[PDB]
Ligand binder design. Sequence first.
Ligand code: 16E
Ligand code: 16E
Ligand code: 16E
Ligand code: CL
Ligand code: ZN
Lengths: 21, 21, 21, 29, 29, 29
Amino acid sequence: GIVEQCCTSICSLYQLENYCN
Amino acid sequence: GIVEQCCTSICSLYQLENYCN
Amino acid sequence: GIVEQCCTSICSLYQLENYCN
Amino acid sequence: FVNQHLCGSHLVEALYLVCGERGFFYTPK
Amino acid sequence: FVNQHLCGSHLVEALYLVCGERGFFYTPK
Amino acid sequence: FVNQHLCGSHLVEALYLVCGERGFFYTPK
Ligand SMILES: *C(=O)CC[C@H](NC(=O)CCCCCCCCCCCCCCC(=O)O)C(=O)O
Ligand SMILES: *C(=O)CC[C@H](NC(=O)CCCCCCCCCCCCCCC(=O)O)C(=O)O
Ligand SMILES: *C(=O)CC[C@H](NC(=O)CCCCCCCCCCCCCCC(=O)O)C(=O)O
Ligand SMILES: [Cl-]
Ligand SMILES: [Zn+2]
């Protein structure tokens, strides 16, 4: 999930985009 | 206080409401 | 820098003002 | 130790929402 | 452990910006 | 280590307020 991926290391804008609709 | 209660564990909306006027 | 100064201890408004233009 | 300072920022935003037209008190002990 | 809770607050703000008119899903596993 | 990243988010908000019409520079060393 997004919290595991992105609160344990910094997520780029590209990686955050995996969670868009 | 609110910082002791709510920064050491997550406060629900119900628990936060104790700090309303 | 600002991150070293102000994320390892709380920066007052006076100390933050060193980073204004 | 800016963790409490930053937590507090989020607490005030949450109390604004929770408390509504009642408003709130923010008093760091 | 409010660290995840506060991180999540920032994640949703970032996804709002990233995703735009697509919008997003926020599902804490 | 997203702690610095999230701290930085709050720093920029604080500098916006502090600096006013002067504006500011944000340069993570
Ligand atoms: C619970 O915490 C998760 C347990 C377990 N682990 C996972 O990591 C979740 C894996 C499924 C989520 C979708 C994965 C997307 C495709 C992964 C390929 C890697 C390429 C891109 C890397 C990235 O994600 O940025 C689980 O089974 O859920
Ligand atoms: C300094 O850090 C505080 C020291 C000490 N401890 C306290 O916990 C404060 C107690 C007084 C605050 C008002 C308490 C409200 C009623 C408590 C009953 C528990 C039921 C609800 C639980 C909850 O608060 O969510 C002190 O003396 O101040
Ligand atoms: C890398 O992390 C920095 C390494 C090293 N250390 C520094 O501390 C940076 C020093 C130069 C920045 C300008 C300093 C301004 C004047 C300092 C005088 C102290 C009075 C006010 C105290 C305050 O800053 O609040 C480096 O060489 O960069
Ligand atoms: Cl934070
Ligand atoms: Zn934060």
